[PDB]
Amino acid sequence: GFIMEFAENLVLRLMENPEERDRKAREHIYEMHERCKKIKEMWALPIRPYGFWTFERHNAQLRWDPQISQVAGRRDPYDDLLEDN
Amino acid sequence: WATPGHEERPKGYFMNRTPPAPGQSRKWEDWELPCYITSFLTIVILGVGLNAKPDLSIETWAHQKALERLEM
Numbered sequence: 001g002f003i004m005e006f007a008e009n010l011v012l013r014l015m016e017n018p019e020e021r022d023r024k025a026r027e028h029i030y031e032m033h034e035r036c037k038k039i040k041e042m043w044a045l046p047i048r049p050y051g052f053w054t055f056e057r058h059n060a061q062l063r064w065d066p067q068i069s070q071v072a073g074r075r076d077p078y079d080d081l082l083e084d085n
Numbered sequence: 086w087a088t089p090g091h092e093e094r095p096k097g098y099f100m101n102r103t104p105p106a107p108g109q110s111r112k113w114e115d116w117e118l119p120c121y122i123t124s125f126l127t128i129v130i131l132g133v134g135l136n137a138k139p140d141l142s143i144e145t146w147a148h149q150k151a152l153e154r155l156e157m
């Protein structure tokens with residue numbers, strides 16, 4: 001053929017779907033705003049959590065001392081006296 | 086007028102480049118081809134691209150919608 005009859009549909013192939021572009025734009029806005037709200041919530045967390053000491057890793061002694069309160073140097077004076085019988 | 090004149094060749098040299106000896110080319114510059122081909126591609130792509138592109142815009146769309154709406 002001639003030049004323009006091919007350059008026309010060439011440019012038309014080069015250009016994209018606008019419906020896809022609009023859908024992607026509204027989508028991206030939706031999830032970006034949702035993620036923005038999520039990050040805003042995340043930044044509100046205090047440095048020290050409400051539980052803190054309640055956490056099992058932050059006790060480390062309520063389940064260690066009971067198995068140590070029997071060794072010498074930690075016993076209540078009234079433990080060795082009546083342990084004989 | 087009737088007399089032919091003088092000054093067989095116009096004075097001065099184009100682009101100040103001295104003419105080469107007869108039988109030899111102009112010895113094109115090292116950037117001459119890469120930039121001339123660039124100019125050629127730009128001219129052709131603007132000529133055939135800006136015209137073969139669809140005339141989609143907001144002026145023509147508003148024109149069509151104003152013609153269709155003014156009748157009512």
Ligand SMILES: CCCCCCCCCCCCCCCCCCCC(=O)O[C@H](COC(=O)CCCCCCCCCCCCCC)COP(=O)(O)OCCN
Binds near residue numbers: 128132133135137140
């Ligand atoms: C010393 C030798 C120099 C030789 C130069 C050429 C010889 C002619 C000299 C005269 C000067 C001509 C300069 C161009 C004037 C163009 C005027 C008409 C332009 C115009 O309105 O029609 C457009 C044509 O686009 C086009 O295709 C225009 C193509 C022009 C290409 C020029 C490249 C310049 C690059 C500069 C880049 C600078 C970038 C800065 C941002 C589209 O019209 P339309 O809207 O109706 O659409 C049509 C849809 N059917």
